[PDB]
């Protein structure tokens, strides 16, 4: 009788009843699983990340608790979802989806993995069968789809809200399902997600750019798991959470426009996901990084002596990462098109260490940044949104004081774009192995690598056993 | 130098440096403390509340964990803050503050008590001195001041947002202080609270009114404690969280207006707080309830001869609780002026049971509700906002089919208004004792009552001991 908003019904129906049949989705989801966990492990090398991990109260004991990869923490699933989601996102190294809204749908793994691990351990304690990694993969496919299809035509950034609302929405649905919710519970959780927090994006932008860019998605996935658990206790929903006149999400926050699902939900997002294969860096600078690295040998010994650097880019890069003047922390820097491009030119490589004070204090960087001129190419802006292409284009050309110049080096498709997928896969696996090596000893690193890259047998691995760190 | 937004600095300075000197504020804080905890204890009689309480995972063990009053739960201080805040607010029985924004600043007790109890138990385990109930009182005074002064001039409801943001903000600042934070940590926690922003109020309004009206403040006071803990780890803040162009709270959510503090922060809100002394019910209906109850003897044997019922009210009541047609759950009903007025007329008293299906199924209620005409009196709307008065006015008159009528019965000041404080205090104590009696056996009820009402003596009680009284 009360009449639930269509978008919430459609998400619910997809989660509960849609069968995923794409081989290619499952194969790509396997890559996203390892790539994401690798990113999370690498983040344990960063004390700014680690300081936010662990239980609220040290020495808390949680029966059948979710384990946090790379650690000895055993946590409630909400807290574990925060820990994992915080890790995997921290270094701006994880996967990415770009349309009307921006985001990183792998962020949902925080909630998915924590909830699937908890459910598995509880089942085991009750003498029942745990979930398998294939269940994790399916839930990732569906989380990706929900967040990514929402992102196609709904721009939260244009109304000043962070993208992580779509993480909370996607996680809440897939978590509710994992935890055994039916149609009513999933609907009710979703409605509570839409009514909830929508965090601002003040921390992703000048002058306030900061480390909340790294942990907001963890906070949102965690919240989704929490809302799902409340729903499983039978807490009531809000049928017209989106549409209610005056008080609904659409009228309050979305400029009275309808939230829309631009296509039927299936496996399109996972199939077309973007990887950050080589460099941690804000995605809109990934191709400027690639072009800078190409130019590096031509500039490395001409080292100051550069008169100006031209950077041609697309509109999203201008809106987010186009900054002049002092940069104050690693988040600020890794969200700076000019900084990233300077690192590529100066060093021929980009690692998360380049964003730290030790490197940033190199006086050459800021001198080279103040020579950079960033302008929009309107064709790049168009091609960024065109469905058969979805390029993320930048071009870079260096001019010298003698009047000569390098060629203008243009990159439309970074190595993580679907068009370069066959080339990328072996490099993704190298990235995974390198990331594991930073944290795990030889025996454990080789064992994880081996299990995770044997995709056939991986499917049938129990989730609790898979969480072997 | 790097320029933090002024509002965040004034809150921070108040929390760290302002000495509270008001004897009246401490006295009233003591009353709020008992009233609030009493309301919480009564909420343990409602399974729709209880279902949300407890640890996330049954059997979780927390060292030096915060205890939840009325229960055996020993929790992390974030989760405890949610439990307590959920309980104290659940039944719409707790204290209230009304201005440009509406709210219930006693909600902040969830975070304050949980944090203070935790800190006390940790101290004790380190061989140090726990906090005392006076510290809890002082933090209440300040939380009330922060949320209530923010409410004087800044209307979240006019931009479609719930009032619990100001709970999150107040709790974050007082929690960060309790937990040992300095100026930088407090500022940084506050800037993260403003950015967190900010739940809708869809669950307080037709046609979606529901039980999230009961737990949203718990969720917010919990979140405040959480943000405070993150700040103590050194997590950075956002200096222009309010004022940043394009991306700041003011430009995104507040229609490009400035968030203002209408007066310097001291002890005004606690001194002037509103109690729900007799009836659980949305505050904007409290005086209509009082007037209905007066009229009850004149109508109780003539309900079938009632032709129409005139209710004259103020603008906030029209915006929130003026509803026609079917009511679907207890939250919908306790947020219905017409329902609450009907109950008073029909029954001469109002309890939380009157909002349950058993009573609501009484066919007389809806029949009476469809005879009610609610209209705004504009003078009530003006006097609701005037600072020397702050009335919450309703008037009720009943007209009969034979053409006679009762007098029009006007109530400007409910029993919980500061102008009726001396009359109220004994009734507040009765309400406390009755609420305790629902949940505690004789010995424990008497003991709690006796400690809590011996105010001189209560001050010095260690927080952990104060909380232990409620547990067994």
From Swiss-Prot, chain A:
The entry's keywords: Lyase, Sporulation, Tricarboxylic acid cycle
Biological-process GO terms, alphabetical: propionate metabolic process, methylcitrate cycle; sporulation resulting in formation of a cellular spore; tricarboxylic acid cycle
Please name the InterPro entries in this protein's record.
Answer: 2Me_IsoCit_deHydtase_PrpD, MmgE/PrpD_sf, MmgE/PrpD_sf_1, MmgE/PrpD_sf_2, MmgE_PrpD, MmgE_PrpD_C, MmgE_PrpD_N
Query: What does the record give as the reaction this protein catalyses?
Result: 2-methylcitrate = 2-methyl-cis-aconitate + H2O; citrate = cis-aconitate + H2O
Q: List the disulfide bonds.
A: none
EC assignment: 4.2.1.-
Q: Which GO molecular-function terms appear in the entry?
A: 2 iron, 2 sulfur cluster binding; 2-methylcitrate dehydratase activity
Pfam name, any one: MmgE_PrpD_N
What induces or represses expression of this protein, per its UniProt record?
Subject to catabolite repression.
Report the function annotation for this chain: Involved in both the tricarboxylic acid (TCA) and methylcitric acid cycles. Has both 2-methylcitrate dehydratase and citrate dehydratase activities. Catalyzes the dehydration of 2-methylcitrate (2-MC) to yield 2-methyl-cis-aconitate, and the dehydration of citrate to yield cis-aconitate. Cannot form isocitrate. Uses either (2S,3R)- or (2R,3S)-2-methylcitrate.
Protein family membership: Belongs to the PrpD family.
According to UniProt, the name of this protein is Citrate/2-methylcitrate dehydratase
